[PDB]
Amino acid sequence: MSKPVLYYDDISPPVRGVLLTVAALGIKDQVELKLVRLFEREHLLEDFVKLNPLHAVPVLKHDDLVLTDSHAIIMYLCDIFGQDGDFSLKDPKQRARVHNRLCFNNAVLFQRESIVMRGLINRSIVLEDHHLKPVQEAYDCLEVYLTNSKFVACDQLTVADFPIVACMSTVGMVCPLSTSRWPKTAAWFETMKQLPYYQQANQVGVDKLKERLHAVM
Amino acid sequence: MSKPVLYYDDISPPVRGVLLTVAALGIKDQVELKLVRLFEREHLLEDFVKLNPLHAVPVLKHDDLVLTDSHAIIMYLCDIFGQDGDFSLKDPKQRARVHNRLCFNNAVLFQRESIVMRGLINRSIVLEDHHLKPVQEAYDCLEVYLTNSKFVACDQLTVADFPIVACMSTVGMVCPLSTSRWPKTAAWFETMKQLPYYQQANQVGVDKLKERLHAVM
Ligand SMILES: O=c1cc(-c2ccc(O)c(O)c2)oc2cc(O)cc(O)c12
Ligand SMILES: O=c1cc(-c2ccc(O)c(O)c2)oc2cc(O)cc(O)c12
Ligand SMILES: N[C@@H](CCC(=O)N[C@@H](CS)C(=O)NCC(=O)O)C(=O)O
Ligand SMILES: N[C@@H](CCC(=O)N[C@@H](CS)C(=O)NCC(=O)O)C(=O)O
Ligand SMILES: [Ca+2]
Ligand SMILES: [Ca+2]
Ligand SMILES: [Ca+2]
Ligand SMILES: [Ca+2]
Ligand SMILES: [Ca+2]
Ligand SMILES: [Ca+2]
Ligand SMILES: [Ca+2]
Ligand SMILES: [Ca+2]
């Protein structure tokens, strides 16, 4: 009878990875949302900093549990809401396959794209090929993964596809996928855009960020 | 009867997080090691790149499972070797608490310290206060965590303490902990250095890196 509370701003790819997960698990009505707007600096308020000293979104509070990383939020939601469904992580090797690709997103893809995007928002940068090489190297890895399995972690859609597509749909606005160069990734990307919950859970926030990018450029 | 194989170089903090975990779980005799030496560029050999397109250590192979992130390796080893022991992740909230701090290491602490250390090794940088501010901000977060619990994830030692101490003992060589400024973290650090397996699993590799740092400086 205790509902997790997701502190969020959907311009954020980490947040949209969680929103995609919530919709895919069918648990929109079980997870309360609390908006923490980055542009208005609500993530720097004293209450939120006390909740998360990293002053970042997303955060999940569930009773006394406070999770402060989208990838930990996603695996936890899988454990308590998805054990007996298509997204289950009950099997140890399947859990590790999915966790391995969550780590790829958190430590590789998201790190490299947020350097580029944050720099454009804050105006540190104004786009040499040097900036996009790390992103393109991450695309190369993703292309290998999607050559060996149909989705990022295995032949079925898993929660690991959601943080990655949230990032891909963001950095794609400055480093677009070439179908000739990354054909498996381009086809996987088109497939994820056809998921019924993609528009509400990811595209809305992507559109907001695109507007901020066109204002800064 | 199938032994996981850890591809490793102990100069790496991610690798040493795993070596600490292996020793703490008491499974040194169950995990085979295969040396992949970074300085000699063994991580760029065709076989290793095929195994891991990120061309990085550590990698764990267990039958057909290939894990390519230390934090995924650590949780998997917990699942298959530590279910009924002091490091167990069977409980969903405990798993999420531990995973949350693994994410902090992978996405915050390790990211910020590897920028500084890689730059010193490759000679991109030669140490303004600008470089160490992100590390000190990560120390500030760690200090909050260790104010609220005795170890990084809860009041017991968990596998999340190991990747973090591996990083702390590395970046500490250029950004040392002040006991007056981060007292809980300094005391936690001294406590981890007293673990019986710390010298072999972490200090050996730290010493090797210290020598490379003094050669480049
Ligand atoms: O750290 C911030 C990060 C971002 C952000 C937004 C979209 C991305 O795809 C991304 O990788 C980062 O947007 C902000 C917007 C703000 O007003 C203040 C901030 O600190 C941030
Ligand atoms: O990427 C590399 C990273 C490192 C490394 C070593 C110690 C650290 O605490 C760290 O954060 C990174 O050492 C290398 C050493 C090499 O010879 C080649 C490399 O690519 C690397
Ligand atoms: N690894 C974290 C990253 C979270 C993160 O960096 N969020 C950004 C937005 S994309 C944020 O809230 N930044 C605000 C700040 O850094 O002050 C996760 O996946 O949750
Ligand atoms: N998030 C990864 C990071 C692994 C990583 O970056 N390893 C470095 C050494 S610390 C490496 O092997 N770098 C070689 C390269 O990038 O070519 C993990 O935790 O396993
Ligand atoms: Ca409601
Ligand atoms: Ca307003
Ligand atoms: Ca309040
Ligand atoms: Ca208050
Ligand atoms: Ca042996
Ligand atoms: Ca040699
Ligand atoms: Ca071979
Ligand atoms: Ca070969």
Residue numbers in the entry:
A (entry chain A), B (entry chain A): 1 to 126, 128 to 218
Show sentences the authors wrote.
Nobo plays a specialized role in the biosynthesis of the principal insect steroid hormones, ecdysteroids. As ecdysteroids are particularly important for the life cycle of insects, it is expected that a chemical inhibitor of ecdysteroidogenic enzymes, including Nobo, would be an insect growth regulator (IGR) that impacts insect development without affecting organisms other than insects. AeNobo adopts a canonical GST fold, which has a well-conserved GSH-binding site (G-site) and a hydrophobic substrate-binding pocket (H-site) adjacent to the G-site.
Next, crystal structures of AeNobo-GSH complexed with daidzein (AeNobo-GSH-daidzein) and luteolin (AeNobo-GSH-luteolin) were determined at 1.95 Å and 1.50 Å resolution, respectively. Daidzein and luteolin inhibited AeNobo enzymatic activity with an IC50 value of 3.87 μM and 3.99 μM, respectively; these compounds are known to exhibit larvicidal activity toward Ae. aegypti. Although daidzein and luteolin both bind to the AeNobo H-site, the binding orientations of daidzein and luteolin in the H-site are opposite to each other. The A-ring of daidzein is nested deep inside the H-site, but the A-ring of luteolin is located at the entrance of the H-site. The Oε of Glu-113 forms a hydrogen bond with the hydroxyl group at C7 of daidzein and two hydroxyl groups at C3′ and C4′ of luteolin. In the case of luteolin derivatives, apigenin, which lacks a hydroxyl group at C3′, exhibited a substantial decrease in its inhibitory activity having an IC50 value >25 μM. These data suggest that the hydroxyl groups at C3′ and C4′ of luteolin are critical for the inhibition. As the hydroxyl residue at C7 of luteolin is close to Phe-39, the A-ring of luteolin cannot form a CH-π interaction with Phe-39.
